[PDB]
Amino acid sequence: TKKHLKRLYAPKDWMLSKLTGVFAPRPRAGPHKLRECMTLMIIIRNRLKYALNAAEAQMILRQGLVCVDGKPRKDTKYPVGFMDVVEIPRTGDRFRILYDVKGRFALVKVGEAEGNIKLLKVENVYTSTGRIPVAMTHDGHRIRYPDPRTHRGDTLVYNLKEKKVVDLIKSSNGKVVMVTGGANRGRIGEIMSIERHPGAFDIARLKDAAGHEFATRASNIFVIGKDMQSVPVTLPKQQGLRINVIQEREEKLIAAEA
Template identity: 55%
Template sequence: MARGPKKHLKRVAAPKHWMLDKLTGVFAPRPSTGPHKLRECLPLIIFLRNRLKYALTGDEVKKICMQRFIKIDGKVRTDITYPAGFMDVISIEKTGEHFRLIYDVKGRFTVHRITAEEAKYKLCKVKKILIGTKGIPHLVTHDARTIRYPDPLIKVNDTVRIDLETGKITDFIKFDTGNLCMVTGGANLGRIGVITNRERHPGSFDVVHVKDSTGNSFATRLSNIFVIGKVRSGFVLVAVDRRVESEFGAMMITYGFDL
């Protein structure tokens, strides 16, 4: 007889991108239920202990979190197994540090430091648009946010920029050919490129063709594409706003885009 959700996760069954060694123990921290899936998230304990090295043990991570030093997307989180995911902003007030979770070229979450100004917003992919009770339009994002009364021009697969303090949409980027995107799933996880074509397959998965900075083309499912900016006449306008360039600038130079 089942007694609620599972509480354990064997270390060998944990996602590979957590980069846990096999010999340190039998178990891995099982992420709590939250806005990101188990295999697409990074628990807070792994970020603080294994990535930042701010703690040596799980107990030390618990002491840090229970002092309410850690914020994710502007909200204090005391759960050490809270599932942080793609584009989440992790803030440590005590040290004045801010991080955004994004993928590296090998599809692993990287420690990407950002400024306090950049930590005020995040980008979210629109997963669903629906009409709720009393005819109120709703929009659901990839991190399980529900936003009422969105701009009628925003459609599924577009990317919205959200002010973390108010939770309101301040800008959006359309899912169009010629725009810059990052792959968030599949064999090409972590790659950045320009959308060149979209193949529609009714009843199956739509396929998107992407061209990266070296001129190599690859294809992936539409559900794996996350639009992060606009490309016009060779210049990259990341996330509509020039201020975001400092955040993605190093990454774009790595991929060879001209800023």
């Protein structure tokens, strides 16, 4: 059982430094995996800057002033992965974490009624006792009584105001879809095709807007909406389009002349 983590062996999507400190926090197990998560203390301290020190993050959280999933937390360490709404009511602000283009955690700011919306990808379906069907998700949530049309790897729109599931969205056909992991993170596009290799990983080919096709694993597909004009949730800072190295450098210079 591991209870310690070193800064280098920790993700640098948390944007820790080589120098200053030796350890990084190992979060308590929860909805999300160690690599894909970002621990509370990291967010509050290094990004939002409502804390300058570890101890100050305990001060805020133990007390309680912070909610995720609309539930208040007294937890110092807790995962925050993907499609999680966090709300600090003291500020009155609602963040929705996502994957920004270029592999960065996005923190995107939402209207208040969008922060009751959430999207969870389904992993398995199975029948449990009493013939009661269950969809188990990638956040470990159990949706009792899902629709009879549910399949593995589809999204379920999930009301956090009161817990239930309205209409689903499938991974079928061309639909607006975004990537999770694999270093095509936050890049958005239509499904062009879904290749099958049975007994092995199923490739899928995505085509983003303004062309430039590419390939990513089925496992890394996470649906957004029916269409780009039917999206239920906001996009991060960049729209889900990447640009060439040359153009990055060019634009960096142009703005620096101001």
